[PDB]
Symmetry: D2
Subunit: 410 residues, 4 copies
């Protein structure tokens, strides 16, 4: 009694076969998108079948088996409701309420220190969800590219710890928040930057990646790495933001020369080239949709959820989530850690890279920032989310009062 | 087919009578103690039955049913391996190796500013486990009484947030760590102590509990909460420690008056009386085993694991856990959050109150402190614990490299 | 060839028989007062001759000599214009213009944290001058008693360096200003208060004075010493201030307990007793006129200018003046040192103890303090004084542009 | 009678003619140099007279008049012993004692971050005196050129206050010492550097001087300014140290970008070019003797003591001396102010620019620095000088215990 046939009848309702649209609809309702890389063969076999019989197609059991056999295990988990969020249709309904609610918060100031950022309209607002099992949901402007800015800091920290290990990386950068009044100091008592989530630390981290090769190859290697983290969804580069960040960033040059003088770089660092590498990394483009997959790689222990590929070592993933917890929303980090309890990372383009470990990854994006540098809609969304679901890090998974737990049906 | 029935067949394993000791040995091997408050009716019936039938010692199906009918639900989960840690026998093997490995860590200095903590032998070393289901295990000197000291700061903060709620409590005290040299500034920029886990924060929080009645009743009020949290195991009091804490507490007096000058207490606070209360709360005694139940209650979203009693609101538990994470280990807080990633609190007696949310609570006691005030052996144990098991708060439950997950078997 | 009437003709004006009023008036015109202790005998001989005769009286070349012979050398410099300010009468004319100019300044708030300090009227305003030669001038409420408060800090520090020397004293207290927003810290990086002019330093200084003996005898000794410093003009004690300063002294008890815990006191100190002694010293009363003598003892290298008695070692006077320069006006100290350039010390009763080295001492008193604790009228008077005369510590004695030099005559 | 003649009678001492050498020796012993600018006429006539009348050579009274007539006033004060240090031959013997004492202090380390200062032998040790009246004395290596380094910081600040006034300049820089081990902060809380005497402060002052012209002209305008201050003694320039200072100046570029980002420079500043000007001003060369004249101009209210020329406004001179008092010896400033009480500035090349207000200026030079950056020999010298002489700024001029007063005689 084989899986492909049990599934066939589970979808077959006792009618002797299954219309293709009716398989596509049942698939989409599990959260999986028909373009999921892990479903390629199934979809290739489907489109081959719709070249044959162009009147239908209506699939019997061996023809259904013919398409679905290569992806049956992933399909059985989808259809039997084994994903981390079983009733994904209900849950994306709540995401949308949360989306509409936060959309009413028009406050904040679009970052304008740079013309590329000032140009973005304050009304742009998108939330994208990718769960640990590949369930996708978007609402809003989830396909408009924008710059990762400081959202790239946890990613490139991840890469560095991935390639070099925790111990090496933290020879050069701390692992604690500075305290709501060393905001302004570049270095802790040990003469290292306080953590990889602030600019001095991000800049040092940058000097660690793929040492020995030139900047063009370093950027290629980070790009190929982001490509894997996003399951080959959109990752681009904004040369306008780049040129302009590097002509309008005296603060970072001040940090660079400070780091150089205190001997904060590995031996042989070319500090002015590192800053230029840094500015490019800040100008990498993503969409809400592709950036949520990247977070979901981090929610999923370093496996990209829509491709199954191992992208980052668990160590790198745990360090990254750890520092995003305490250091990820700038001056709001401790408040965010207390009330939201989620690892998150914000950037000046208006994005919050949000990770719900073991559940989902998310990317919120609205250009208007509050006075601490965080997207107003983004922040408002993060508070709502944790007020709704027991996703706060220290919510209890058994006794969670009247909050909703999307991981369950009852 | 009733459940006391199905389970009777589960234990009988072929025979039609079950020897009593066979049911007891099966019970103990689930981690449950035979003294479990949730098992009293069943254990009273087994005692009575052995009195009225020394012509055994074997339990019919009808007889086994008269004994377990009371506690059948729990006994079901214990026996159908439904507890948070199913193979508890193997897990305690690991706790014992962890215990032995930390035991060989002879360094440190016993706190001798009081002649009551100075008396304790450096060789005392105890580790007690109580899971979210009541599963108990202890190794080492887990029945020696010692003073909580600063391990009581999360407990009384939890009581404050329980009775008064998050917004009121944090009018008087912050929710962030300070910075690894703001250890000496009693106040943050809003003239609030930084968090409840430092002395000025504990002192201010002590002043929010049971306002308006004397220290006799305030104390009894807190003790009664500490009894419910520990499932009514040992919660004592060391008047010897308390007299010396108050004869030798220049700094807290420095803090108390400084707090009074800055208007940090609620209106009509008798600060010098609040310091005396505070010194009393520090002198409360526990054992590794009784305190492990307190940790387990915070592990369990505020329900005591061996009684089923709701002791704390989720809100209280979530805040307490949030702040033990980032502030609970003094100047080691940030490194502890990074490498161990578990809510913990330490005290100058040598305790570390340890919480694995949704899994278990623990208490580790060894008096010799490292130069940052934390028990050497406790600290070494906590690192090994999370090297071995995917209990780091930002470990992943599905992809955890070479770590072991005791929540599943095979 | 006698000095005694190379002078009576200096006074005689060709006429050969000097009236008394005309000798007193010429005396007063030099700045000396008819009650100068150095002039007692000459005034004793005048009191006797004024009863030998009611018909006059007046003097000739031998009963003049009869009265003045005892104090001739001091009289000769007085009448030959050899004092530090020759044309004293035009100088008091400027002090009066400075006085009245500052009286128009109604800003400020009278310290009211003490009902004694809130008792005093905002309209009180007095400036008192005593030069290094005993020349006196007053204008305004220069006889109203008021507490020294922090004005006593340089005095008791002087006494302390006097009795124990520079090296011993600075084992316990620093000799620099802190940094204009590390006022809040009680201890520098060596665990000493920053300087004797802040409350932590003053409190440590208080613990050095007359160690071994008790508070009643210690207060008598400071009083004897203040009495010498002030040429036995008015010094007293306000108990109302004392009792109110010791009820409302939470900050000082914070310093006391902080100091004791960091082991900041000489071995054997009774901290709580030192604070009461400290509170007494702040309650010591003076007048403008009497305090200006105390300042003039410091202007004059430690000799009281109206008795000639050597009250303080030079060491003590230099150290005191050094630190009143940099630390004596609280958070205004560095501005004050920059613009006024005079060793000065303020207190919350409204007093500015002002010293012009090698020239004069003063006491300004007006109770309305500014936002930084300094008497408004006082500060304003001090700026005017240095705008007008080249008394700025880094004015040039030879080239000084538009400024007047009262020490000269062209 | 005439003053040339009266003075001729005093040097002739009975005979009818004064040998020329008898008059030169009389003049030199006053401390004046035979090359004094204010003496060129008299000295030109003396050389011309030894040509036109080789017959001797002895100056009758008519011939002595023809030589000293144009310089009679200065020669009078020189010979009626009316200079600020009357017995200059006795005081120089003391400077020589102070010199040789401090010579035996071979400790400290020569600045080596730049090759051209690692050049200098650790045994070079020169002390030069120039009084407020032109009396000169040198001992040691007083004609070796060295770089002003930070000794230029009071000079250019003076130039800036001279041309711009106190109020404008101190919109851009403060006037207080920072706080010891608060040397790291480039900015105080008004986002101004702390004082002109630290690098951030100096760099901002550099950008106020002569806004609107290129570095060629800014530099020349400062140089001609230093020249007048040195009475046209040697004021050089080490293009070697400038090129090197600019290659290895990471901290300064760090300061530069930091200040530009904080909007610390006058509008329209070319910060990179301001840094190059700054590195130039640091490379200006002097000698002990020439810089001793620059300090003497600061000793003398801004008049160059050997030319009579007004160089700096008294305001400029008083601010500079105020800030050298509190901020001029790096982290030793507060200790230096306390024990030396003399306006001084130090530099990495080994120089201490020292000012005894109203008396003399000095340059001590020895390349080995102590750990705080201050010349070990210079520091040792300054302490000896003030232990010997009542030159401490808060020494008393009339009561100075056993200290010696070189302003006095018998
Ligand atoms: O330990 C050293 C040596 C040392 C070492 C290294 C450098 C300097 C000094 N010195 C000292 N540490 N602590 C001292 N005094 C205790 C009594 C009063 N205390 C205060 N608590 N909070 C304060 N500030 C605010 O509430 C406001 C604020 C918040 C954030 C930023 C700015 C202002 S004052 C602590 S003395
Ligand atoms: O912050 C204000 C005043 C201000 C301005 C406005 C409002 C309030 C206060 N001014 C300024 N902030 N930042 C400035 N410049 C940056 C250049 C690199 N700087 C560093 N200095 N020190 C660092 N770390 C250590 O030394 C290690 C350590 C930490 C703790 C204890 C002991 C040692 S990094 C900061 S200048």
């Amino acid at each position: 009694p084989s899986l492909e046939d049990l599934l066939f009848y589970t979808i077959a309702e006792g009618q002797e076969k299954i219309p293709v649209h009716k398989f596509i609809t049942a698939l989409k309702s599990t959260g999986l998108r028909t373009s999921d890389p892990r479903l390629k063969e199934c979809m290739d076999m489907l489109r081959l079948t719709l070249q044959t019989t162009s009147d239908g197609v209506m699939l019997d059991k061996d023809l259904f088996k013919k398409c679905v056999q290569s992806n049956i295990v992933l399909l059985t988990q989808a259809f039997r409701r084994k994903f981390v969020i079983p009733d994904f249709m209900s849950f994306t309904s709540h995401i949308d309420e949360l989306y509409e609610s936060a959309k009413k918060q028009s406050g904040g100031k679009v970052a304008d220190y740079i013309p590329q950022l000032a140009k973005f309209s304050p009304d742009l607002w998108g939330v994208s969800v990718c769960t640990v099992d590949g369930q996708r949901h978007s609402t809003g402007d989830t396909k408009v590219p924008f710059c990762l800015q400081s959202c790239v800091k946890p990613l490139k920290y991840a890469i560095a710890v991935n390639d070099l290990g925790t111990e090496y990386v933290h020879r050069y950068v701390g692992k604690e928040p500075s305290g709501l009044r060393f905001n302004k100091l570049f270095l802790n008592e040990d003469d290292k930057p306080h953590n990889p989530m602030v600019n001095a630390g991000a800049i040092v981290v940058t000097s660690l990646i793929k040492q020995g090769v030139n900047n063009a190859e370093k950027f290629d290697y980070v790009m190929q790495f982001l490509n894997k983290m996003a399951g080959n969804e959109y990752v681009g580069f904004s040369n306008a933001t780049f040129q302009s960040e590097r002509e309008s960033g005296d603060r970072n040059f001040a940090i660079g020369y400070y780091l150089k003088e205190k001997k904060c770089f590995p031996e042989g660092t070319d500090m002015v080239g590192i800053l230029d590498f840094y500015f490019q990394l800040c100008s990498i483009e993503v969409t809400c949709e592709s950036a949520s997959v990247m977070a979901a790689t981090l929610a999923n222990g370093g496996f990209c959820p829509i491709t199954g590929e191992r992208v980052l070592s668990p160590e790198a993933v745990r360090n990254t989530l750890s520092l995003m917890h305490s250091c990820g929303m700038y001056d709001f980090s401790g408040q965010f850690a207390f009330h939201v309890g989620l690892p998150a990372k914000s950037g000046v383009a208006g994005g919050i890279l949000l990770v719900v470990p073991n559940v989902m990854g998310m990317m919120c994006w609205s250009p208007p920032l509050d006075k601490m540098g965080n997207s107003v809609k983004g922040i408002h969304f993060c508070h709502d989310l944790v007020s709704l679901c027991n996703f706060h890090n220290y919510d209890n998974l058994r006794h969670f009062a009247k909050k909703l737990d999307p991981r369950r049906e009852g």
